[PDB]
Amino acid sequence: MKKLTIGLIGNPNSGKTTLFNQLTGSRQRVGNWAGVTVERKEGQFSTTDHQVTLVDLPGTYSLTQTSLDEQIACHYILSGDADLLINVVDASNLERNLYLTLQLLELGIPCIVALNMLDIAEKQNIRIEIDALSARLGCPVIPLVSTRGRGIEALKLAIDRYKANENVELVHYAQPLLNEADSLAKVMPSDIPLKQRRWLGLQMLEGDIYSRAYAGEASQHLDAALARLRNEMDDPALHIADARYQCIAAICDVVSN
């Protein structure tokens, strides 16, 4: 049969594999990603409604000198093979972990946040306003202690209610950057979802060399775009990052305490 394919993505050491085992138990296979010795492992588990297959992706800080783990990750996310994702976030490092989170949401891939290691966050004396965070990201947030199995049943419930992310505003990029992002997006392949073309546009404009491969003909116009921005603005590349951290930092002030 056709199964619901879920991608488990998060930062290094965010309790990702512990969650994988807690879901899939024995029902798992190990192999390797195409043309690269890096291991690929995926599993099987059942919610009330769905037969799930879970691909354990490699830990990555962002989707942009890199590593294979980064790259294999970003590839899988932009493939369409997964019906949704499970972002595994270390609660004791929200601000660090949420950079990857924002990127996934700017692609507009449906996902649930698995807020993990709150027992460490508690010990570090930090609490997260879960439902505040839920609103800001515009997607589910489910509390977890992966080592203890807390809210695994709560996570499975959230899977059966998988739904398009609330098209809420996240980062607030300067008007020109969006114009140019969108401008490049226009001359990319029409089959790729608009939202992803806008994201691929920004990453190109920031300086991601890999993203140009998806951009098609847009890779040409990059020089024209960047030249224009330089007149209107100092280090467009750097402005992009600033908008992201500003956003995360604003969110974290409200959500964490």
Ligand SMILES: Nc1nc2c(ncn2[C@@H]2O[C@H](COP(=O)(O)OP(=O)(O)CP(=O)(O)O)[C@@H](O)[C@H]2O)c(=O)[nH]1
């Ligand atoms: N103390 C504590 N540890 C946790 C919790 N959830 C997961 N962990 C731990 O985090 C450690 C990280 O291992 P793992 O679960 O494999 O994370 P990972 O993301 O797979 C690490 P990599 O990405 O390198 O494979 C584990 O020893 C596990 O016990 C928690 O709520 N509290």
Ligand SMILES: [Mg+2]
């Ligand atoms: Mg792991």
